[PDB]
Ligand binder design. Structure first.
Ligand SMILES: [Mg+2]
Lengths: 100, 147, 50, 83, 233, 226
RNA sequence: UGGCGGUAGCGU
């Protein structure tokens, strides 16, 4: 993370699709280095649906510049999450903040 | 025994290969040239010194001649491979030969950034510095006192 | 504000500390500016250029 | 062991035939198996040629007359061998 | 006691502030030998201190560093990076193979390493990975060697004689156990000379090196290097 | 290879520029060890080498450093500077008082100092002063003491005696330079060149040996147990 | 076992 920043790192990190953002709130049912399974809350439930969101993080995929694209989780089991909360950190991102 | 064996010792990087390379570059000038060769001093001959790394090490005093700064600039090295070319590299294109600009005769080798600052700091005087007013037998005594 | 934050951290307000030479060990004649800066590694690597 | 050739330049006089005579001498010792007129401190042929011009042991005139000397000598040797 | 004879400094105190932070006091010193000795010892200690470090890793199901294991919360590269910071002390030999086996949800600390007797874990609470699911187990074989300085993976693999099979991961080894050195010279009281100095060396290490042993080793290295100048052809 | 082994110096190239000028070279050294050895040796040589030097001088007819003498055209400061450069070796005692008396012409050198046996002037031709007046008599009493390092007269600070800066250490221009050196394929080695200019009391090749011996003896307490 | 075109960037 930048020790001195401008406060726009969060917006740049979130708006770019490099980080995994929770679509619906809930709790982290199963966290793993490659996938995240989130048990959504009853408020955001859909009829006739079990209510689990599965995020498959992209691990070590080459970019257009022959660099490395990797996503690392930043949540633990049982940790409550809300809509818009980051679940994984993309390349050059630390806890949802841009880290070049 | 054969030149094929010569390449086979070369690319495997045997120990004696470094000694051979040091022997062959002892007095073999190399021409360093920057991409925009605006004037005559854009290409100059230098004596190679083998170093570890992937970057060419350039003498600071010639940088003003090359109009080169160390922020990503690249230089091209050419190897003369005839006796005549080595002779003209040593006698005509050598950096020591080029001291005056052919455009106007002004010198081309001047201290620019840190040498000037160091010499300026060294050659300065306070009024109450330590060891003021003593008499010294010579410059060696002054250096010893400073150290 | 920067000076107040430095004072909170028990650091000199001028931002310059006294350094020592690694090789000879003698103290430098003047305080030097020591701090923390964000450095970036640009996509211009020497092994891709040599 | 050589950095500047200003004295060699002034000895030759024009900095151009100096290169030619140095190259000719370097070829003479490198290819013709000639013995340098100065001790070699682990130096290349070009550096030796430049170093032995400094005290005047090599220039165009004496090199030409010396080459003529051994060419007359080899012509005479061939003539004697024929006879 | 005279101009010709110098007072020989000696160790007088070893103040162990913590398991890593330590203070070594040497006295007496004769008008400038303190600064020279402190600088020389600092330069030697920061570069010539032998220590044990992790060199090779081998996980049960992992085949390369850029992969992931089902159950662990961190990448294999992250696991290797945490293993790089593991501090151990080895007595008797310069080569050890340790085994780690963990199962169930929880952190995998250095305390999970199988006891070997001649290997001591200075930091038993050093975490390595996190198992985030039941029925998921991690089995690792860690390779630890004794050496000096910083030897990257390329330098070790330049021999290429072993031709290690797929799944054996190489990690850069930082054998140096001393992380920070700071020397300070002050006045020392020795009966009535009134001009002698004492040198206090504050050293922060990983806990795998004895400060007194480190000072002794640095002095031995300095003397061995200086005997060549003593002879002088 | 082993942890306890180090690249010991080799190829000790020693050349003598003059009688009291030396240039030593040591090619193989561990990375950063060249600076460690050179700085320590330089500091010890110029701050801890014992030696005998002139400390104070008694001048007849002169009571202060800024006075004037009609016999010698050189000022008192010049006389003090000339005396400071004199190198004297003393055996058997710490302090010696020497007497100098001259008259007539003024080629006053160190050879005119009264002979005492113990004192040995390395350069008796060293000029001290110059007399202009024909019947000009100069009588001086100098004191040479054995000390260590350089002790300026300001810190040392009765009408006749005048204090002069004492240079006990017999060394001048001790300079070390460490540059690159390659052995097998390891180009990260340090080659150390040491240039020294002794005053003349001892051989420059002996000053390095004495400094190294002093430093080694300083570390004996920790070195002996290893 | 090459060329053309477009795009972006680096050093001037
Ligand atoms: Mg540039």
């Amino acid at each position: 993370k930048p020790l001195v920043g401008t406060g726009m790192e969060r917006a740049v990190a979130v708006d770019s699709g490099v980080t995994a953002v929770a679509k619906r709130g809930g709790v982290v049912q199963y966290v793993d280095a490659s996938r995240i399974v989130i048990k959504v809350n009853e408020d955001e439930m859909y009829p006739g649906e079990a209510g689990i969101d599965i995020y498959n993080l992209t691990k070590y995929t080459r970019s257009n510049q022959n660099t490395c694209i990797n996503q690392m989780p930043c949540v633990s089991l049982g940790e409550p999450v809300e809509r818009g909360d980051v679940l994984a950190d993309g390349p050059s991102t630390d806890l949802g903040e841009l880290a070049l | 025994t054969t030149i094929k064996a010569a390449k086979k010792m070369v690319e495997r990087e045997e120990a004696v290969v470094w000694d051979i390379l040091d022997e062959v570059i002892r007095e073999h000038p190399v021409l360093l040239n920057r991409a925009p060769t605006l004037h005559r001093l854009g290409i100059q001959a230098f004596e190679p010194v083998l170093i570890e790394g992937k970057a060419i090490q350039l003498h600071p005093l010639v940088c003003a001649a090359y109009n080169a700064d160390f922020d990503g600039d690249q230089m091209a090295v050419h190897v003369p491979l005839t006796l005549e070319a080595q002779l003209e590299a040593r006698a005509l294109m050598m950096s020591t030969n080029n001291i005056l600009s052919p455009a106007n005769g002004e010198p081309i080798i001047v201290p620019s950034q840190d040498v000037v600052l160091g010499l300026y700091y060294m050659t300065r005087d306070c009024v109450n510095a330590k060891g003021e007013g003593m008499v010294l037998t010579g410059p060696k005594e002054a250096e010893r006192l400073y150290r | 504000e920067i000076k107040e934050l430095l004072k909170l951290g028990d650091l000199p307000t001028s931002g310059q500390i006294r350094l020592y030479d690694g090789r000879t060990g003698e103290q430098f004649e003047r305080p030097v500016t020591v701090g923390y800066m964000y450095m970036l590694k640009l996509n211009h690597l020497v092994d891709d250029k040599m | 062991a050589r950095v500047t050739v200003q004295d060699a330049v002034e000895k030759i006089g024009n900095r151009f035939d100096l290169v030619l005579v140095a190259a000719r001498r370097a070829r003479q010792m490198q290819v013709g198996g000639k013995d340098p007129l100065v001790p070699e401190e682990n130096d290349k042929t070009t550096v030796i040629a430049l170093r032995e011009i400094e005290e005047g042991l090599i220039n165009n005139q004496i090199l030409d007359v010396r080459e003529r000397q051994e060419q007359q000598e080899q012509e005479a040797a061939e003539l004697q061998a024929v006879t | 006691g005279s101009v010709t004879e110098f007072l020989k400094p000696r160790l007088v105190d070893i103040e162990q502030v913590s398991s890593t932070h330590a203070k070594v006091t040497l006295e007496p010193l004769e008008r400038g030998f303190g600064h020279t000795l402190g600088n020389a010892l600092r330069r030697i200690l920061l570069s010539s201190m032998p220590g044990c470090a992790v060199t090779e890793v081998e996980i049960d199901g992992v085949l390369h560093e850029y992969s992931t294991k089902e159950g662990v919360q961190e990448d294999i590269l992250e696991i290797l990076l945490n293993l790089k910071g593991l501090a151990v002390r080895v007595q008797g030999k310069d080569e050890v193979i340790l085994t780690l086996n963990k199962s169930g949800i929880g952190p995998v600390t250095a305390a999970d390493i199988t006891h070997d007797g001649d290997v001591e874990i200075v930091k038993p609470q050093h975490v390595i990975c996190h198992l985030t699911d039941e029925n998921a187990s991690i089995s690792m074989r860690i390779k630890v060697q004794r050496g000096r300085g910083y030897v990257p993976a390329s330098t070790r693999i330049h021999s290429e004689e072993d031709e290690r099979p797929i799944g054996r991961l190489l990690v850069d080894a930082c054998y140096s156990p001393v992380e920070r050195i700071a020397y300070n010279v002050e006045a020392a009281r020795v009966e009535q000379r009134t001009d002698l100095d004492k040198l206090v060396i504050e050293m922060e290490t990983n806990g795998t090196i004895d400060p007194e042993e480190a000072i002794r080793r640095a002095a031995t290295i300095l003397a061995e290097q200086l005997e060549a100048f003593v002879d002088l052809r």
